[PDB]
Chains A and B, each alone.
Chain A
Amino acid sequence: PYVEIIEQPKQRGMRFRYKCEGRSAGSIPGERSTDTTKTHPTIKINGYTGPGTVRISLVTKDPPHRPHPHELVGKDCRDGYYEADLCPDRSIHSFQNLGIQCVKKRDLEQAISQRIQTNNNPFHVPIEEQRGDYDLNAVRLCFQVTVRDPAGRPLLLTPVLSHPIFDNRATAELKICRVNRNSGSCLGGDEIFLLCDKVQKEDIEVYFTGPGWEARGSFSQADVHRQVAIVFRTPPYADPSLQAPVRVSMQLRRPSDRELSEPMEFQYLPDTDDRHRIEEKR
């Protein structure tokens, strides 16, 4: 009897745009989206399946989750949020279309007017719990799912918040300062501590490029220590039966703009003598 986001939206990367220009053209990508593979904000209902509705509104990033002056745009959207029927045949609901339309502070006093007008306040906070500090830098999608009571009452499920999604910053200079290791097995799996300048954990990776080769270092968003260090494991090299060491490039890469830091040489090697605690040629 609950809604769980299975595919959080991509946090960094998307630029909140204004109505004057136009509606949009592109929608909020899913967290697992790559520059080639597409995904979208996806949810899943538990303990239930059948008719019903889903409402998706914007809300602040900070605890007192107040409605947000920005207004989701696109299909099934109106007044500022999204609202459509729930396909009864499946329990997983993805949104292939959703756009964050930003409001201009000069008219933010109007946007909020409408918010309470259409009483679009998922967590319904009082008018005194709606201060004037609106972090227009971010926003969080709110999932108001409605269904049927085991009897007849339209059961309104608990509103689930997505990870805040941010706007366009750009521009920072990816710089690798130190690396405790610039050599490892061709079978990959080597842990490496890398010290860098400030980086964002939802928008960073370690790009290992070679001649006609390319892989990424394995690590979690949590392995990004305070924006200035990254602990990850090296990917397997193209040739896993390497007989002679091979130099490869290793760099910081910001996905949202394809930006790359200066390359640092990295030398793959075979497991030869270590793969069996030395034996051959006694």
Chain B
Amino acid sequence: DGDSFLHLAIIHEEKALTMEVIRLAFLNFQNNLQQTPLHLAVITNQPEIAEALLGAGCDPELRDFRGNTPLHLACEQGCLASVGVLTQSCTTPHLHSILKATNYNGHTCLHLASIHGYLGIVELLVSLGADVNAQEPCNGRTALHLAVDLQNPDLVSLLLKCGADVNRVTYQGYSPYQLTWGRPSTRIQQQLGQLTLENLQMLPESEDEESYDTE
């Protein structure tokens, strides 16, 4: 923990103490976990401290040992307040910016919020410019593929009204609907079957000792 003149102050809920006001290039490094003070603001769930971005905190990577930016942390923890504060910070409108940033697992802020069913964070994100159809690198799943895997019906109807392409496949060439087979939720295979392309609905049938989807 290569703590800075703020971690301790941060971890410890303090006033100006945990908010030294200055106002070699004033900055805040990160511990052995690669956490910048701002990450602690989110983890610790104290928006105000984050509210005080002050010197543009880590504007490029600003990541952790898992590859998360503060906003990523806010989205998997589910703190609406932080998503709210960490969003005004005029940097995300840039290129590559957070709304498109991914941790070492290729997860977007949208992905993390979908994984934990935070329907409200998912909505705010897409509203601010997140690609509801962004794909994750392991298998190319979109948040809609994950909602089906997570068997979250509330989540899937919400990705539908946000623009999620019911079609669009995985590296294995499967639509979110093709992932319902073998799972419980009839409600999920009902709100997707209809929408999904006719030939993106059934599963491959033992073809030529392999059986690929083709894409």
* A interface residues, Cβ below 8 angstroms from B: 4, 6-7, 32, 61, 163-164, 201-202, 218-223, 225-226, 231, 233, 276-279, 282
Contacts and interface: CB of A to CB of B under 8 A. Distances in A.
B35 A279 contact: no
B104 to A, nearest CB: 14
Given A32-B184, A220-B181, A221-B181, A279 B211 contact: no
B178 A277 contact: no
B149 interface: yes
Contact of A222 (B11, B39, B44, B172): B172
Given A202-B182, A277-B35, A277-B64, A222 B174 contact: yes
Nearest to B186: A6
Contacts of A202: 182
A225 B205 CA distance: 12
Given A6-B186, A218-B149, A277-B35, A226 B11 contact: no
Q: Is the interface of B mostly helix, strand, loop or mixed?
A: loop
Interface in B177-207: 178-184, 186, 190, 193, 202-203, 205
Contact of B183 (A7, A220, A231, A277): A220
Given A218-B149, A220-B149, A222-B174, A276 B43 contact: yes
B8 interface: yes
B33 A278 contact: yes
Given A218-B149, A220-B149, A222-B174, A279 B43 contact: yes
B210 interface: yes
Contacts of A278: 33
B64 A221 contact: no
A264 B190 CA distance: 37
Given A222-B179, A225-B172, A277-B33, 12 more contacts: A163-B202, A218-B149, A220-B181, A221-B181, A221-B203, A226-B210, A233-B149, A276-B43, A277-B73, A278-B33, A279-B11, A279-B43
Nearest to B32: A278
Contacts of B182: 201-202, 219-222
Nearest to A8: B181
Interface string B114-136: 00000000000000000000000
A230 to B, nearest CB: 11
Nearest to B42: A277
A89 to B, nearest CB: 21
Nearest to B138: A191
B193 A4 contact: yes
Nearest to A205: B182
